[PDB]
Amino acid sequence: STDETPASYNLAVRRAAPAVVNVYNRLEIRTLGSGVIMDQRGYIITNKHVINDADQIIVALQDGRVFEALLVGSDSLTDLAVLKINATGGLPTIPINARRVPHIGDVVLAIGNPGQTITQGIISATFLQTDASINHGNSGGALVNSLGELMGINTLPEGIGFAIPFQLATKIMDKLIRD
Amino acid sequence: STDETPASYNLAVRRAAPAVVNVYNRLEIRTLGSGVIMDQRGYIITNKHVINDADQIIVALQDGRVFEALLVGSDSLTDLAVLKINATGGLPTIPINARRVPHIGDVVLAIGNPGQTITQGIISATFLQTDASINHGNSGGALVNSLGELMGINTLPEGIGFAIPFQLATKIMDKLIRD
Amino acid sequence: STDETPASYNLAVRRAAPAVVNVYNRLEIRTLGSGVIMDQRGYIITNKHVINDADQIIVALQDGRVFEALLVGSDSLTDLAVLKINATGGLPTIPINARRVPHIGDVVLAIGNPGQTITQGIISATFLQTDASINHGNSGGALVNSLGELMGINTLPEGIGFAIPFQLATKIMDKLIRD
Ligand SMILES: [Cl-]
Ligand SMILES: [Mg+2]
Ligand SMILES: [Mg+2]
Ligand SMILES: [Mg+2]
């Protein structure tokens, strides 16, 4: 068995896990939830709920770096929020594939922080429904396929989880950045 | 990543999902549960519990068609029921393989309607036990392997789900049709 | 579909399932939990909690054999315990690979007895965290990858399960055997 390799979804994790961060409040410090680094500019999606009633927002990467974050705006209807941080050289960004089409049955990992936690499941249906366990911390976290490509943003029917389609999430983010 | 394909169980879904239907009661209309189209003749398995206290039974396919259903009979012990609908040309039937032998560890999708929901898991043991989440709607629904072949009929120990072996379910159906 | 083979993790099950046993108390007979046969000498790991308040310990293999077990010792901090049974010829032992490195994302089956139950999931994080459902019986049971190699010992955050790393578990066992 030492020769053979164990079936795993590790590749996807290495690709997307660095992009997913912990979100915090701020002396008093509390843990709010998860978030995702979209682009180099330093824009980060997260849930509207974590941001609310936050005086100071803090973000923590998997490599150890720690930033102060600015609230770019939110969207009540989809429970989303965007944040901004000063973009150093070589920020870890969540892999995105605008071309990929999410089909029902696709393997999906859910990444967040109910430390960092990776659950597995499939696309139950396409709002997006999945049976990868979604708790309080991994809300605002990522949801990617086996390739690692972003498929959705976890949010908050037992055993049933909800993610916002990445394309829709992408569009919402662009508008918030604008408006 | 755009070149590579994401691991998925979509093939199985396309093969078996059309066969799985929504079951209803009937002005008043209520949602009862799930069901499975066995053959062209128009016989459909479902749980005994959904059928009980139903004045009018209605069935809804994934292509949009909608029928009035007749209760062929039930079986108290296994909580099963069979239904009949007028068979149009080219009814979607659940793939069955009498030859296939269900082994423990086999990948299995659970199909039903706690809209339509697909959960994933494995055969925990062979009554048949699985860790694909089973709620109220997907009871009466299908349980198929990766190939799409029917493995069991979901029914109603947290995290633990129960399906009736397809062979046994097949035999029960034949008898009800007779008796 | 009869030609093609359904994706499954059965191979792993046949390799590791014989090694996992049921643990019992003893006229009065009660079911305590699960356990794992480490080596030919007849040493078996299990949780500290099942052993406590046990007057007589009994072990049951998947081939039908049944032994009286001796408590080699326990470890309060890690909730572990080791047991001894007279080693007949050709005891089923849990496959171990000291060389294998558990990566996050690895497919993992959890084996125990909330009869014998096999749940599936992945390594959520490395204490070891997994989303293979862990109940009361499968505590003290095994946790192996797809190859079948031992990865951890299940123990007792919904949807989140904990296993003790096999290497650490191995070291603890050696010390208990000594001390
Ligand atoms: Cl699961
Ligand atoms: Mg899951
Ligand atoms: Mg499941
Ligand atoms: Mg699971």
CATH number, domain at B36? Answer: 2.40.10.10
**On the CB side of B55, how many CA atoms lie within 13 Å of its CA?**
5
B79 is an active site residue: yes
Chains touching chain B, criterion 3+ CB pairs below 8 Å: A, C
This entry's atomic model was obtained through X-ray
Radius of gyration of chain C (CA): 16
Q: Are residues B151 and B89 in the same domain?
A: no
Q: Which residues on chain C are in Cβ contact (under 8 Å) with B148?
A: 1
Reported in sequence order, the residue ranges of chain B that DSSP labels E, i.e. its strands, are 20-25, 30-37, 43-47, 57-60, 66-75, 80-84, 107-112, 117-125, 128-130, 142-145, 150-155, 161-165
Domain stop point among A94, A114, A139: A94
Q: Are residues C71 and C117 in the same domain?
A: no
Q: Are residues B11 and B48 in the same domain?
A: yes
Distance CA C101, CA C96 (A): 12
Q: Which CB contacts under 8 angstroms, 24+ apart, belong to B155-160?
A: B155/B47, B155/B78, B155/B79, B156/B47, B156/B49, B156/B79, B157/C114, B157/C135, B158/C133, B158/C135, B159/B131, B159/B133, B159/C119, B159/C133, B159/C135, B160/B124, B160/B129, B160/B130, B160/B131, B160/C114, B160/C117, B160/C133, B160/C135
Domain stop point among B74, B94, B114: B94
Ligand nearest to the CA of A121: 2
Nearest to C104 among A5, A13, A135 (CB): A13
* Number of other CB atoms surrounding residue A127 within 10 Å: 12
Residues of A identified as active-site: 49, 79, 139
Give whole-number Cα distances, C147 to A142, B47, B97, C16, C141, in Å.
29, 38, 28, 10, 17
Q: Are residues C33 and C112 in the same domain?
A: no
Q: Closest by alpha carbon to B55, among B32, B85, B36? A: B32
Q: Closest by alpha carbon to C107, among C149, C67, C51, C72? A: C149
Structural domain of residue C66, as residue ranges? 1-94
B74 is an active site residue: no
Q: Are residues A85 and A113 in the same domain?
A: no
Interchain pair A6, C106: CB under 8 A: yes
Q: Which residues on chain C are in Cβ contact (under 8 Å) with A5?
A: 147
Q: Are residues C20 and C79 in the same domain?
A: yes
Q: Are residues C29 and C62 in the same domain?
A: yes
Domain stop point among C44, C67, C94: C94
Nearest to C116 among B122, B125, B149 (CB): B125
The resolution of the experimental structure, rounded to one decimal in Å, is 2.7
Q: Closest by alpha carbon to C69, among C24, C6, C10, C8? A: C24
In the structure encoding, which two tokens stand for residue B82, read together? 């069979």
Q: Closest by alpha carbon to C74, among C144, C134, C29, C140? A: C140
Q: Are residues A47 and A109 in the same domain?
A: no
Ligand nearest to the CA of A161: 2
Distance CA A5, CA C140 (A): 26
Distance CA C166, CA C152 (A): 5
Q: Are residues C153 and C100 in the same domain?
A: yes
Q: Are residues A9 and A47 in the same domain?
A: yes
Give me the number of domains chain A comprises.
2
Distance CA B139, CA B42 (A): 20
Q: Which residues on chain C are in Cβ contact (under 8 Å) with B95?
A: 1
Nearest to A125 among B12, B118, B120 (CB): B118
CA–centroid distance for C5 within its chain: 29
C53 phi-psi bin (left φ>0, alpha ψ -120 to 50, beta other) = left
Instruction: Look at residue C62 and give its three-state secondary structure.
Output: coil
Q: Are residues B100 and B51 in the same domain?
A: no
Distance CA C152, CA C129 (A): 10
Q: Are residues B177 and B166 in the same domain?
A: yes
Q: Closest by alpha carbon to A104, among B18, C84, C82? A: B18
- Contact status, residue B11 vs residue B17, Cβ threshold 8 Å: no
State the greatest distance between any 2 C-alpha atoms of chain A, in Å, as a whole number.
56
Residues 85-114 of A with CB under 8 A from B: 95, 97, 99-100, 103-107
Q: Closest by alpha carbon to B47, among B127, B137, B117, B159? A: B137
B46 phi-psi bin (left φ>0, alpha ψ -120 to 50, beta other) = beta
Residues of C identified as active-site: 49, 79, 139
Among C106, C124, C129, C133, pick the best mutation site for testing chain A contact (most A Cβ within 10 A).
C124
